[PDB]
Amino acid sequence: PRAKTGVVRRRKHKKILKLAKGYWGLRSKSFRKARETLFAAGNYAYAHRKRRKRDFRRLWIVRINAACRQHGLNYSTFIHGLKKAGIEVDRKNLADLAVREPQVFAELVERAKAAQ
Amino acid sequence: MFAIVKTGGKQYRVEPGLKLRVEKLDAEPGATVELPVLLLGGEKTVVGTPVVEGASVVAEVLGHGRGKKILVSKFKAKVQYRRKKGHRQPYTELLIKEIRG
Amino acid sequence: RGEVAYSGRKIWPQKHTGRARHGDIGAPIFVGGGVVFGPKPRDYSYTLPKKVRKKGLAMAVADRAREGKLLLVEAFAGVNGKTKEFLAWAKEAGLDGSESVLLVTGNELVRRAARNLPWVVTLAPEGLNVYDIVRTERLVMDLDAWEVFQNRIG
Amino acid sequence: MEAKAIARYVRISPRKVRLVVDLIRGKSLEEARNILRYTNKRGAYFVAKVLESAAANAVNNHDMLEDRLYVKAAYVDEGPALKRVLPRARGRADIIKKRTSHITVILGEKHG
Amino acid sequence: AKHPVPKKKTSKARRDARRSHHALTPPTLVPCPECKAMKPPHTVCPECGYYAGRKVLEV
Amino acid sequence: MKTYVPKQVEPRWVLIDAEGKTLGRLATKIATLLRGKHRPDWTPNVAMGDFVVVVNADKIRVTGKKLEQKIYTRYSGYPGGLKKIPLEKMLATHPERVLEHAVKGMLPKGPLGRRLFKRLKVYAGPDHPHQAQRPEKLEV
RNA sequence: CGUGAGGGAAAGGUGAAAAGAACCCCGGGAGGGGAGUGAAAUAGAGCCUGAAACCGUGGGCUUACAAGCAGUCACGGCCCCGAGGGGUUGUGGCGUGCCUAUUGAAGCAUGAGCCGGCGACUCACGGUCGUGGGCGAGCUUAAGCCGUUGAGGCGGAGGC
RNA sequence: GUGGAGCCUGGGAGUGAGGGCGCGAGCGAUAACGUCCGCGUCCGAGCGCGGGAACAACCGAGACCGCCAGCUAAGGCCCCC
RNA sequence: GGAUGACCCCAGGCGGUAGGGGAGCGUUCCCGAUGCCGAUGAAGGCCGACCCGCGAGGGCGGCUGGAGGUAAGGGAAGUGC
Numbered sequence A: 001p002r003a004k005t006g007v008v009r010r011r012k013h014k015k016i017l018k019l020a021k022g023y024w025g026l027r028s029k030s031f032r033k034a035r036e037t038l039f040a041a042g043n044y045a046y047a048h049r050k051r052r053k054r055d056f057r058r059l060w061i062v063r064i065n066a067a068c069r070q071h072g073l074n075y076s077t078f079i080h081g082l083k084k085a086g087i088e089v090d091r092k093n094l095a096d097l098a099v100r101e102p103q104v105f106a107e108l109v110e111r112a113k114a115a116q
Numbered sequence B: 001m002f003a004i005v006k007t008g009g010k011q012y013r014v015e016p017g018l019k020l021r022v023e024k025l026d027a028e029p030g031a032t033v034e035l036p037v038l039l040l041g042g043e044k045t046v047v048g049t050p051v052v053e054g055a056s057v058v059a060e061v062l063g064h065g066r067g068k069k070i071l072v073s074k075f076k077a078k079v080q081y082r083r084k085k086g087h088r089q090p091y092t093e094l095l096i097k098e099i100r101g
Numbered sequence C: 001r002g003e004v005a006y007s008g009r010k011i012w013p014q015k016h017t018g019r020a021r022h023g024d025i026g027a028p029i030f031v032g033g034g035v036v037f038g039p040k041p042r043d044y045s046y047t048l049p050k051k052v053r054k055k056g057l058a059m060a061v062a063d064r065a066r067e068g069k070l071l072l073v074e075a076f077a078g079v080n081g082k083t084k085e086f087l088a089w090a091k092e093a094g095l096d097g098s099e100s101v102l103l104v105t106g107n108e109l110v111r112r113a114a115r116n117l118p119w120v121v122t123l124a125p126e127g128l129n130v131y132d133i134v135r136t137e138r139l140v141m142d143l144d145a146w147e148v149f150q151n152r153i154g
Numbered sequence D: 001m002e003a004k005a006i007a008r009y010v011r012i013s014p015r016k017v018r019l020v021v022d023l024i025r026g027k028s029l030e031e032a033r034n035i036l037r038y039t040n041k042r043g044a045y046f047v048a049k050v051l052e053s054a055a056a057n058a059v060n061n062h063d064m065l066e067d068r069l070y071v072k073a074a075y076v077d078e079g080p081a082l083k084r085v086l087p088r089a090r091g092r093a094d095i096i097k098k099r100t101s102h103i104t105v106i107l108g109e110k111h112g
Numbered sequence E: 001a002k003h004p005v006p007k008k009k010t011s012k013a014r015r016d017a018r019r020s021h022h023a024l025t026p027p028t029l030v031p032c033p034e035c036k037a038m039k040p041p042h043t044v045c046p047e048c049g050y051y052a053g054r055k056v057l058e059v
Numbered sequence F: 001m002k003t004y005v006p007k008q009v010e011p012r013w014v015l016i017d018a019e020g021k022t023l024g025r026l027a028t029k030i031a032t033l034l035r036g037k038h039r040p041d042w043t044p045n046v047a048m049g050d051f052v053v054v055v056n057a058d059k060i061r062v063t064g065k066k067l068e069q070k071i072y073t074r075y076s077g078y079p080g081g082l083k084k085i086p087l088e089k090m091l092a093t094h095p096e097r098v099l100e101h102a103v104k105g106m107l108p109k110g111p112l113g114r115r116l117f118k119r120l121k122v123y124a125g126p127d128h129p130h131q132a133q134r135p136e137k138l139e140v
Numbered sequence G: 001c002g003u004g005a006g007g008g009a010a011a012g013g014u015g016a017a018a019a020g021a022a023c024c025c026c027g028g029g030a031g032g033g034g035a036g037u038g039a040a041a042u043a044g045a046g047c048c049u050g051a052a053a054c055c056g057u058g059g060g061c062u063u064a065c066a067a068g069c070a071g072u073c074a075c076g077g078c079c080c081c082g083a084g085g086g087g088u089u090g091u092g093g094c095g096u097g098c099c100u101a102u103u104g105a106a107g108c109a110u111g112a113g114c115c116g117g118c119g120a121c122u123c124a125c126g127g128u129c130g131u132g133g134g135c136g137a138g139c140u141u142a143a144g145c146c147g148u149u150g151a152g153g154c155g156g157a158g159g160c
Numbered sequence H: 001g002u003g004g005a006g007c008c009u010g011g012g013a014g015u016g017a018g019g020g021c022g023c024g025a026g027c028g029a030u031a032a033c034g035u036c037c038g039c040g041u042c043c044g045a046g047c048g049c050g051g052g053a054a055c056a057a058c059c060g061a062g063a064c065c066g067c068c069a070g071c072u073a074a075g076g077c078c079c080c081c
Numbered sequence I: 001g002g003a004u005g006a007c008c009c010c011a012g013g014c015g016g017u018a019g020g021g022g023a024g025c026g027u028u029c030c031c032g033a034u035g036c037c038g039a040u041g042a043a044g045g046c047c048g049a050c051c052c053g054c055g056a057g058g059g060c061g062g063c064u065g066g067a068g069g070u071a072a073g074g075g076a077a078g079u080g081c
């Protein structure tokens, strides 16, 4: 029996093109350019999931640094103090406290100065 | 009153009435669980070293789910290497009931 | 590509046309060209060992016997070649047509009467084979047919 | 209520007629008629004809009032091309495409 | 010369941008003071054959 | 919980006296203010730093022999279009540019970074025309 | 097409039934709009289905101080569907196409305009391992012959 | 010393253009992103990740997937960062 | 563990070119099928933010289409661009 392509290739090309919706020019219209665009897209997504974790830690740290310097110490001193005090609140929540709960953060700062 | 709790290797600021998604807990839907407390705030401030001895947050597990599928896709040029993996992160959904100081 | 109707001529020069190189238009790379490794007339038969098929024959009958779906009969009463007659007989024999039946007999008149029934497959005992046994829910045999069968598997 | 006309397989290049159709999109029938009349393009003849066919349809078939009519939508689509050989130097034959247009005019009524 | 040639197909975007100057400007028309028909200014009215308030042309 | 993002805030206008200060060490601080990195709600993709007013930019200071050896450079795009201007001459002609250049070089490149530079107002001489914004005096 | 020997295409489908659209209307015609036929008329003869490239009309978001393998991660704005999602993308982070060939390519090394369809590890006989079964000092038939008319059997010559 | 260790029999390969670096020599000129061997390594195949401005093979380190959590490596902590 | 791919628990491995091995998806055709799905709508087409699957894919729903399609389990190839 003969088994011609028939339906199969069109359906595969459609899967790819649907994923490429939104892409510029031929990157969303041509199967070939869509597929190339997607290769890169997937690698970026993987790399940037990893990178997103670093991106946010850097942001927290910057905010934490600014909140600390309002109370007369820098970030690196503040983190040492927290360590000596045994306080384990992470940078994500430190940064939140620094903005949403300035009294609590100021309290944390005291403990950190004292612990040293 | 808010508490900073620790579950699934991560920390969250919770309050009564908060619905929260966390890493999957080994606990039946409808059960209630108690989360370790790192810090208390709002009216009174108490600071854990690292956790506060007395306190706990009571949470009702609303249920477990699977996250929206993420396409983890790998490609190496000029080497015919392509990998396509579908990933759905399991989670437990919690309803924060009370902060027991 | 050797059997297709085109000429063996090189369709254009090897070099300097600015196109891909080609020989004749019979090459499978051409629409309308020869096909690569397409089917050719082929004999699918092979000699399955005699003992295997004899054993298979015995086992197939055994399976039906183990289920209580093997029935032998001495004669076929009044069936003289009419389907209506076989039907009447079948009813008494417990064959209501709710089960498919492989009917094995040397009686031509019986085979003619039953052969047009959708639920009946008919065979002379020399033709007993395991595909037809396994195809059907019930096995019905002549004492005579049962005998040539026992000779065959002996 | 809308009225519409289509002139299909008009032997003129679509890119050329569109230039003209763009001139009358959204215009009142009377304004369109004046524009087409003094537009110095071959396409004006064809778009005028379709315009008028649509106006007649409006009045005669669809109970619309001529004095209320405006070009509510209009566009040109490509028809099948007529392919023709254009002989070049050194024995080369090029293919000229003599293109074709489907011209649509749609009239509506501007109330009040 | 050595037969210059386009290096890349022009994109739909760039092609259509080159044409941003191609739209026709409508013919400029005024009413004919005699018969009120629209016509180009400074031309003899084709509808009534008047120009400068007098008959010039059989129309 | 998602990291806090600020709704737009009324920026804070700040006034700085440049007299006697070391050119580069003052610049780093103006940049920080411009970026708004001194604020606990700092967000990297919006303009939310301070507006910085600077006076006595002509009295900026510099160590070593830089007055005559630091060369500002400009390329016109034309053959031989490399222009070389020493610090002394820049101070004697467009003094405010010295700080401006120092700070601009310390801001991120890009649209936001360019926007941040516009929030810097540098004046030679003790005065600025910004009383209307009532700049808060800053010791740095 | 070729002097000639010779080479050598493309091109199938309305509907159940032509009932293949009288007549009116714009138009020189083509074409269309009504009427009408039909279960259906984007089944109307340039006719089943009607993908994709490609072209256009309308709408939402967006864009004229901006540096780009065109995406991706984050946040914010607007629109839409109704602690959620979809669309769009302002700013910020990161970011050297695909394939081939190479010690080494984003590479200024090969190939590809784009889309659709055709397109390359097979079959026979023999061998050699492995493997699922049959039988086991034995295993097995070939050509044929009889039967069947999608029935199987006989056949020991011969082979190991 | 229990390791994607080893040995034995058999089935299937691919490879037989290497390249950089360190050390040891020859050739070259105490030249070459040179050439030819030896021991090792990495790239090749890790043009995946951090550092080195950028950069296969230098330093750090062997990427199953997810996380808006923590600790470190080299390298860094005036601003771009 | 439990006895046997029943599922759970603890642990360790899981970068990868040439290449070896394993397990699957889908296409055409045969048996299953004198059956079964089908005009209360087959195949094919167009959507989908929904469900299952690691994935290749498979469902389901809306629209189109208007007459075919074909299960569990097996068989054979002109089988995936």
Ligand SMILES: NC(=[NH2+])NCCC[C@H](N)C(=O)O
Pocket (backbone or CB within 6 Å): C111, C112, C115, C116, C122, C123, C124
């Ligand atoms: N003698 C026989 N009954 N042979 C088998 C049946 C013949 C025929 N194929 C049928 O089914 O009608």
Ligand SMILES: [Mg+2]
Pocket (backbone or CB within 6 Å): A004, A005
């Ligand atoms: Mg094919």
Ligand SMILES: [Mg+2]
Pocket (backbone or CB within 6 Å): A004, A005, A006, A007
């Ligand atoms: Mg096909």
Ligand SMILES: [Mg+2]
Pocket (backbone or CB within 6 Å): A005, A006, A007, A008, A009, A010, A011
């Ligand atoms: Mg296909």
Ligand SMILES: [Mg+2]
Pocket (backbone or CB within 6 Å): A008, A009, A012, A013
């Ligand atoms: Mg494909």
Ligand SMILES: [Mg+2]
Pocket (backbone or CB within 6 Å): A010, A011, A014
């Ligand atoms: Mg399809």
Ligand SMILES: [Mg+2]
Pocket (backbone or CB within 6 Å): A008, A011, A012, A013, A015
């Ligand atoms: Mg597919």
Ligand SMILES: [Mg+2]
Pocket (backbone or CB within 6 Å): A021, A022, A023
């Ligand atoms: Mg987009």
Ligand SMILES: [Mg+2]
Pocket (backbone or CB within 6 Å): A023, A024, A025, A026, A027, A028, A029
């Ligand atoms: Mg596009």
Ligand SMILES: [Mg+2]
Pocket (backbone or CB within 6 Å): A025, E012, E013
């Ligand atoms: Mg475009």
Ligand SMILES: [Mg+2]
Pocket (backbone or CB within 6 Å): A029
């Ligand atoms: Mg397209």
Ligand SMILES: [Mg+2]
Pocket (backbone or CB within 6 Å): A045, A046, A047, A048, A049, A050
């Ligand atoms: Mg990742």
Ligand SMILES: [Mg+2]
Pocket (backbone or CB within 6 Å): A046, A047, A048, A050, A051
């Ligand atoms: Mg990364």
Ligand SMILES: [Mg+2]
Pocket (backbone or CB within 6 Å): A053
């Ligand atoms: Mg990390």
Ligand SMILES: [Mg+2]
Pocket (backbone or CB within 6 Å): A072, A073, A074
């Ligand atoms: Mg300090």
Ligand SMILES: [Mg+2]
Pocket (backbone or CB within 6 Å): A083
């Ligand atoms: Mg520490």
